[PDB]
Every structure is written in structure tokens, then in C-alpha cells.
Amino acid sequence: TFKEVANAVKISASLM
Amino acid sequence: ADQLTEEQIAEFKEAFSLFDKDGDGTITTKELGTVMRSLGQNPTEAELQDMINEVDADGNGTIDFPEFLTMMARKMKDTDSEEEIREAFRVFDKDGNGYISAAELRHVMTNLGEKLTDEEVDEMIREADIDGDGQVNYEEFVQMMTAK
């Protein structure tokens, strides 16, 4: 999903 | 008082359902390390054991519901704007030429633990495309963050 998934892919900003 | 926007409470448990394939609230340490691989990076299998190990307070072997955001907690000290935006944008757009590619989420989302073809992503890209062009520009996906 383009709308909801944003919070899913954005959780990679801590370790990366 | 109880609800402001159903997306920030209902769709959050919709986001957890994206990683946790078992539905019990636990994912393999192989997946979480794959967060880098969405950026077209390297999988941190051994290092996420260094994070699963510390977050598995209820010791699931895997990871539980409450201790999930704690790994993000350490680095969650003052978030950036466009840097945090690109950490989802170039991470999402496999090409990045004003439009986002169709077969990208089947590439990325598959890497995020849900193995599917462009077909399943097509409904995922259609949501970003009101004109049904099968690809995502800066303006449509942008809208998705002002409304995550």
C-alpha cells in the first residue's frame, strides 16, 4: 500500500 | 476524546500486521534486518539478534508487541525532515525519475516480508495513482506522509 505502508518503510530510519 | 482519526489507532495495528506473519505479534529476526534491504542494502541478521535479544523482554525468540518500538527508541532522539522523508522515498522509489515504478513494492514489499508480484502491488500503486498510471510521482506519495 502506498498510503499506510509509509509508517512501515519509515521505521528503518533508526538503524539506517 | 476516544478517537481523532481511526488511521492513527486502527491502521497502526494494520502496520504491525505487515511484519508479523504469525498474527500473534512476533516476527523472525531475519525480517527486521531486512529494513536496510528496502534501501537496496545489506541484511543485518547477526546485528538484529543484537536488537531482538535486547527487545525480547517476554523472550519470544522473535519479537513481541510492546518492545518493538524500543529498538527505534534509542535512535528516536530528534527526528529530521527531508532526511527522514528520503528514508522512505528513495527507499520506496527503485528508480526515482519523478515517478515510482510499479514492480517496486513487489521488489521492496517482498523484502519487507510479504512475497508478492506487481499485481498485489498494483492495488498498492493504484492507491497512489488517481489517474491509474501504474506509477507514483512525488505528489501522490507525498500526500501519504501528510496523512500516514
mmCIF file of C-alpha atoms in Angstrom:
data_model
loop_
_atom_site.group_PDB
_atom_site.id
_atom_site.type_symbol
_atom_site.label_atom_id
_atom_site.label_comp_id
_atom_site.label_asym_id
_atom_site.label_seq_id
_atom_site.Cartn_x
_atom_site.Cartn_y
_atom_site.Cartn_z
ATOM 1 C CA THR A 1 0.000 0.000 0.000
ATOM 2 C CA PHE A 2 1.280 3.470 -0.939
ATOM 3 C CA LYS A 3 -0.783 5.304 1.766
ATOM 4 C CA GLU A 4 -0.368 3.219 5.027
ATOM 5 C CA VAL A 5 2.995 1.499 4.246
ATOM 6 C CA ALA A 6 4.829 4.881 4.720
ATOM 7 C CA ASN A 7 4.961 4.307 8.505
ATOM 8 C CA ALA A 8 6.283 0.755 7.803
ATOM 9 C CA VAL A 9 9.221 1.723 5.494
ATOM 10 C CA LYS A 10 9.973 4.827 7.677
ATOM 11 C CA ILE A 11 10.772 2.581 10.718
ATOM 12 C CA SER A 12 14.151 1.864 9.016
ATOM 13 C CA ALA A 13 15.412 5.392 9.847
ATOM 14 C CA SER A 14 16.733 4.304 13.286
ATOM 15 C CA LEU A 15 19.193 1.523 12.321
ATOM 16 C CA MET A 16 19.711 3.005 8.823
ATOM 17 C CA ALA B 1 -11.872 12.134 23.285
ATOM 18 C CA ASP B 2 -11.518 8.457 22.286
ATOM 19 C CA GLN B 3 -10.744 8.795 18.559
ATOM 20 C CA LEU B 4 -9.388 11.631 16.401
ATOM 21 C CA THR B 5 -8.561 9.738 13.243
ATOM 22 C CA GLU B 6 -9.110 5.997 13.012
ATOM 23 C CA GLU B 7 -5.870 5.708 10.928
ATOM 24 C CA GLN B 8 -3.550 6.588 13.857
ATOM 25 C CA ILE B 9 -5.097 3.818 16.041
ATOM 26 C CA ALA B 10 -6.646 1.146 13.751
ATOM 27 C CA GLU B 11 -4.207 1.300 10.810
ATOM 28 C CA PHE B 12 -1.270 1.152 13.268
ATOM 29 C CA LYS B 13 -2.319 -2.381 14.186
ATOM 30 C CA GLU B 14 -2.547 -2.705 10.441
ATOM 31 C CA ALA B 15 1.136 -1.804 10.117
ATOM 32 C CA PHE B 16 2.150 -4.373 12.765
ATOM 33 C CA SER B 17 0.248 -6.976 10.746
ATOM 34 C CA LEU B 18 2.591 -6.120 7.821
ATOM 35 C CA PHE B 19 5.688 -7.588 9.536
ATOM 36 C CA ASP B 20 4.204 -10.164 11.992
ATOM 37 C CA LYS B 21 3.288 -13.008 9.639
ATOM 38 C CA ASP B 22 2.117 -15.234 12.545
ATOM 39 C CA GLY B 23 -0.542 -12.737 13.727
ATOM 40 C CA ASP B 24 0.457 -13.491 17.349
ATOM 41 C CA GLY B 25 2.688 -10.402 17.385
ATOM 42 C CA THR B 26 6.105 -11.912 16.588
ATOM 43 C CA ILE B 27 8.397 -11.756 13.593
ATOM 44 C CA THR B 28 11.664 -13.510 12.667
ATOM 45 C CA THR B 29 14.984 -11.647 13.222
ATOM 46 C CA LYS B 30 15.707 -12.217 9.512
ATOM 47 C CA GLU B 31 12.941 -9.743 8.521
ATOM 48 C CA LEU B 32 13.755 -6.816 10.764
ATOM 49 C CA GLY B 33 17.273 -6.814 9.467
ATOM 50 C CA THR B 34 15.816 -6.618 6.012
ATOM 51 C CA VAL B 35 14.780 -2.963 6.761
ATOM 52 C CA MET B 36 18.122 -1.910 5.205
ATOM 53 C CA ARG B 37 17.461 -4.081 2.155
ATOM 54 C CA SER B 38 14.445 -1.859 1.285
ATOM 55 C CA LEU B 39 17.035 0.864 0.722
ATOM 56 C CA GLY B 40 18.608 -1.729 -1.564
ATOM 57 C CA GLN B 41 21.085 -2.509 1.201
ATOM 58 C CA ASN B 42 22.519 -5.336 3.221
ATOM 59 C CA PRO B 43 20.514 -7.647 5.655
ATOM 60 C CA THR B 44 21.559 -7.423 9.342
ATOM 61 C CA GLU B 45 20.780 -10.892 10.562
ATOM 62 C CA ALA B 46 23.562 -11.033 13.163
ATOM 63 C CA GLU B 47 23.177 -7.401 14.316
ATOM 64 C CA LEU B 48 19.371 -7.589 14.721
ATOM 65 C CA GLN B 49 19.941 -10.518 17.037
ATOM 66 C CA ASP B 50 21.769 -7.835 18.989
ATOM 67 C CA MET B 51 18.440 -5.929 18.989
ATOM 68 C CA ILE B 52 15.975 -8.846 19.118
ATOM 69 C CA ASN B 53 17.968 -10.193 22.018
ATOM 70 C CA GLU B 54 17.539 -6.924 23.966
ATOM 71 C CA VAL B 55 13.911 -6.310 22.924
ATOM 72 C CA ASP B 56 12.659 -9.915 23.529
ATOM 73 C CA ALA B 57 11.706 -8.975 27.148
ATOM 74 C CA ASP B 58 8.947 -11.534 27.023
ATOM 75 C CA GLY B 59 11.518 -13.624 25.182
ATOM 76 C CA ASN B 60 9.637 -14.666 22.057
ATOM 77 C CA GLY B 61 12.811 -15.841 20.328
ATOM 78 C CA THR B 62 11.473 -13.413 17.878
ATOM 79 C CA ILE B 63 9.986 -10.009 18.860
ATOM 80 C CA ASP B 64 6.855 -9.012 20.810
ATOM 81 C CA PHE B 65 4.187 -6.216 20.552
ATOM 82 C CA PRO B 66 5.305 -3.521 23.200
ATOM 83 C CA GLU B 67 9.110 -3.941 22.990
ATOM 84 C CA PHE B 68 9.011 -3.423 19.174
ATOM 85 C CA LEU B 69 9.255 0.424 19.211
ATOM 86 C CA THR B 70 12.085 0.280 21.822
ATOM 87 C CA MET B 71 14.695 -0.577 19.235
ATOM 88 C CA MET B 72 13.523 2.514 17.341
ATOM 89 C CA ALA B 73 13.502 4.272 20.767
ATOM 90 C CA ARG B 74 17.314 4.562 21.065
ATOM 91 C CA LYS B 75 17.705 6.309 17.676
ATOM 92 C CA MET B 76 14.348 8.189 18.086
ATOM 93 C CA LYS B 77 16.194 11.205 19.521
ATOM 94 C CA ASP B 78 15.012 14.269 17.487
ATOM 95 C CA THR B 79 13.675 13.256 14.036
ATOM 96 C CA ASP B 80 14.762 15.031 10.833
ATOM 97 C CA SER B 81 12.553 16.368 7.995
ATOM 98 C CA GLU B 82 13.611 15.509 4.376
ATOM 99 C CA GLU B 83 16.273 13.092 5.698
ATOM 100 C CA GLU B 84 13.514 11.030 7.334
ATOM 101 C CA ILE B 85 11.396 11.615 4.190
ATOM 102 C CA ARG B 86 14.127 10.272 1.881
ATOM 103 C CA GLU B 87 14.427 7.339 4.348
ATOM 104 C CA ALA B 88 11.127 6.327 2.902
ATOM 105 C CA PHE B 89 11.165 7.999 -0.537
ATOM 106 C CA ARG B 90 14.388 6.710 -2.274
ATOM 107 C CA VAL B 91 13.865 3.674 -0.116
ATOM 108 C CA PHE B 92 10.495 3.252 -1.843
ATOM 109 C CA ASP B 93 11.237 4.563 -5.400
ATOM 110 C CA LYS B 94 13.511 1.919 -7.022
ATOM 111 C CA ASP B 95 14.175 4.369 -9.903
ATOM 112 C CA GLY B 96 13.383 7.945 -8.766
ATOM 113 C CA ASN B 97 12.597 9.746 -12.031
ATOM 114 C CA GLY B 98 9.587 11.856 -10.974
ATOM 115 C CA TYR B 99 7.553 8.624 -10.901
ATOM 116 C CA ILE B 100 7.731 5.449 -8.786
ATOM 117 C CA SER B 101 7.928 2.171 -10.534
ATOM 118 C CA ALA B 102 5.174 -0.393 -10.493
ATOM 119 C CA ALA B 103 7.213 -3.528 -9.842
ATOM 120 C CA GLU B 104 8.962 -1.779 -6.961
ATOM 121 C CA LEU B 105 6.891 -2.805 -3.976
ATOM 122 C CA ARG B 106 6.875 -6.407 -5.191
ATOM 123 C CA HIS B 107 10.674 -5.899 -5.017
ATOM 124 C CA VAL B 108 10.693 -3.851 -1.728
ATOM 125 C CA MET B 109 7.478 -5.175 -0.006
ATOM 126 C CA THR B 110 8.778 -8.698 -0.724
ATOM 127 C CA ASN B 111 11.940 -7.600 1.030
ATOM 128 C CA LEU B 112 9.706 -6.256 3.812
ATOM 129 C CA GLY B 113 8.346 -9.820 4.381
ATOM 130 C CA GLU B 114 5.314 -10.078 2.070
ATOM 131 C CA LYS B 115 6.273 -12.053 -1.067
ATOM 132 C CA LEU B 116 4.031 -10.866 -3.922
ATOM 133 C CA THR B 117 4.085 -9.886 -7.587
ATOM 134 C CA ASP B 118 3.316 -6.443 -9.202
ATOM 135 C CA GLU B 119 -0.388 -7.477 -9.219
ATOM 136 C CA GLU B 120 -0.769 -7.168 -5.448
ATOM 137 C CA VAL B 121 1.395 -4.030 -5.519
ATOM 138 C CA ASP B 122 -0.731 -2.692 -8.406
ATOM 139 C CA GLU B 123 -3.583 -2.141 -5.932
ATOM 140 C CA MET B 124 -0.832 -0.748 -3.707
ATOM 141 C CA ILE B 125 0.327 1.635 -6.514
ATOM 142 C CA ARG B 126 -3.246 2.358 -7.703
ATOM 143 C CA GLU B 127 -3.873 3.937 -4.266
ATOM 144 C CA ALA B 128 -1.153 6.475 -5.126
ATOM 145 C CA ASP B 129 -2.372 6.895 -8.681
ATOM 146 C CA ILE B 130 -5.791 8.578 -9.051
ATOM 147 C CA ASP B 131 -5.338 8.526 -12.840
ATOM 148 C CA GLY B 132 -4.384 4.796 -12.830
ATOM 149 C CA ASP B 133 -0.965 5.257 -14.490
ATOM 150 C CA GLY B 134 0.607 2.353 -12.536
ATOM 151 C CA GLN B 135 3.444 4.526 -11.117
ATOM 152 C CA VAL B 136 3.961 7.028 -8.253
ATOM 153 C CA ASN B 137 5.121 10.672 -8.608
ATOM 154 C CA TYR B 138 6.433 12.887 -5.738
ATOM 155 C CA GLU B 139 2.983 14.499 -5.183
ATOM 156 C CA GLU B 140 0.891 11.401 -4.659
ATOM 157 C CA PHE B 141 3.194 9.525 -2.186
ATOM 158 C CA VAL B 142 3.857 12.942 -0.533
ATOM 159 C CA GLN B 143 0.214 13.092 0.381
ATOM 160 C CA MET B 144 0.676 9.725 2.090
ATOM 161 C CA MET B 145 3.047 11.212 4.741
ATOM 162 C CA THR B 146 0.914 14.308 5.459
ATOM 163 C CA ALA B 147 -1.592 11.501 6.072
ATOM 164 C CA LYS B 148 0.280 8.333 7.098
#
